[PDB]
């Protein structure tokens, strides 16, 4: 396959250094991210930097953290609550 | 006491049938009264009960609205590799049914 940045709103076909590790894709393999997108992802702010204008934002039920929902990039950064809404992964570790 | 598992309903009775709802965190299907369950079966549960919540998006290839970050709508869509979501019809048409 052609290797390209898996941020679909970037799609860069080249990068500085090696490709960076991204989020798990549906197949389980890790996404390839360019130097920019991968840098945001490493700092845990990919969606805040690159999905700021997309729909689907909610907030964590236990803290102020905004969470981009319906998004593969943030998919394992939150938990779906039985009574509605989401909590981020830190608060989820704190609540069992 | 058996109660409708839509927290904004909680009716203690039902007409005809308790209907099967969304898969809960444990994997079991929720028990819904006939109202809420009919809304669920027609894929409009979140449109009826969650219209004012955050988390709403649009299907990647059609106009269907999809309530994301919501356990009730979680088997009503598929997450795409491009960061968006697709409804179940578009998913069946694209080969993405998991
Ligand atoms: Zn990129
Ligand atoms: Zn995102
Ligand atoms: Zn939180
Ligand atoms: Zn009900
Ligand atoms: Zn909903
Ligand atoms: Zn669709």
Curated annotation (Swiss-Prot), chain B:
<comment type="function">
    <text>Transcriptional repressor of gene expression involved in embryonic pathways, such as LEC1, ABI3, and FUS3. Repressor of the sugar-inducible genes involved in the seed maturation program in seedlings. Plays an essential role in regulating the transition from seed maturation to seedling growth. Functionally redundant with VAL1/HSI2.</text>
</comment>
<protein>
    <recommendedName>
        <fullName>B3 domain-containing transcription repressor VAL2</fullName>
    </recommendedName>
</protein>
């Amino acid at each position: 396959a052609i290797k390209v940045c898996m941020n679909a709103l970037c799609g860069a076909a080249s990068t500085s250094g090696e490709w960076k590790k991204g989020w798990p894709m549906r197949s389980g393999d890790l996404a390839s991210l360019c130097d920019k997108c991968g840098c945001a992802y490493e700092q845990s702010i990919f969606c805040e930097v690159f999905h700021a204008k997309e729909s689907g934002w909610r907030e964590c039920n236990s803290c102020d953290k905004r969470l981009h929902c319906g998004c593969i990039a943030s998919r394992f950064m939150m938990e779906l609550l039985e009574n509605g809404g989401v909590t981020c992964i830190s608060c989820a570790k704190k609540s069992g």
